Design a protein around this ligand. Structure first.
Ligand SMILES: [Cl-]
Ligand SMILES: [Cl-]
Ligand SMILES: [Zn+2]
Ligand SMILES: [Zn+2]
Ligand SMILES: [Zn+2]
Ligand SMILES: [Zn+2]
Ligand SMILES: [Zn+2]
Ligand SMILES: [Zn+2]
Ligand SMILES: [Zn+2]
Ligand SMILES: [Zn+2]
Ligand SMILES: [Zn+2]
Ligand SMILES: [Zn+2]
Ligand SMILES: [Zn+2]
Ligand SMILES: [Zn+2]
Lengths: 72, 74
């Protein structure tokens, strides 16, 4: 049967959301490590990682785009 | 025929470095716009911009990824 472009993204969205709920500090470490790739130091990237944790839907969007390479 | 021309990556990498040299303030403003989409505030991303500016090679790869959706190979 079908494979909706909608369905693939909802499949990938669901998996990532469940990781944020079950292992949030691990997901926060994924952000830190992406930003550290560009020689940004913890004292510099820290507040961005903290800003995302406080906005779970934005944090989920950020992972979808910058960890998984996906768009809406 | 078979294709060998400098790919989208090669061309955008050329274009993106020239911007960084010629209109760095404009490329800094692009990072602010990108991180602001995810609810981040200037006092939060300001230090990240400031660090990217001091590291031209890091900054180029940042823009390739966060602006243009392209990974650095290998
Ligand atoms: Cl939110
Ligand atoms: Cl550098
Ligand atoms: Zn089928
Ligand atoms: Zn099938
Ligand atoms: Zn994941
Ligand atoms: Zn993740
Ligand atoms: Zn994960
Ligand atoms: Zn051909
Ligand atoms: Zn052709
Ligand atoms: Zn081609
Ligand atoms: Zn372009
Ligand atoms: Zn550009
Ligand atoms: Zn740019
Ligand atoms: Zn530009």
């Amino acid at each position: 049967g079908s494979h909706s472009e909608a369905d693939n993204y909802a499949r990938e969205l669901k998996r990532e959301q469940e990781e944020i709920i079950r292992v949030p500090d691990t997901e926060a470490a994924e952000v830190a490590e992406i930003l550290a790739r560009y020689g940004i130091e913890p004292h510099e990237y820290g507040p961005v990682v903290n800003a995302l944790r406080k906005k779970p839907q934005a944090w989920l969007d950020f992972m979808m785009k910058f960890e998984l390479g996906l768009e809406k």
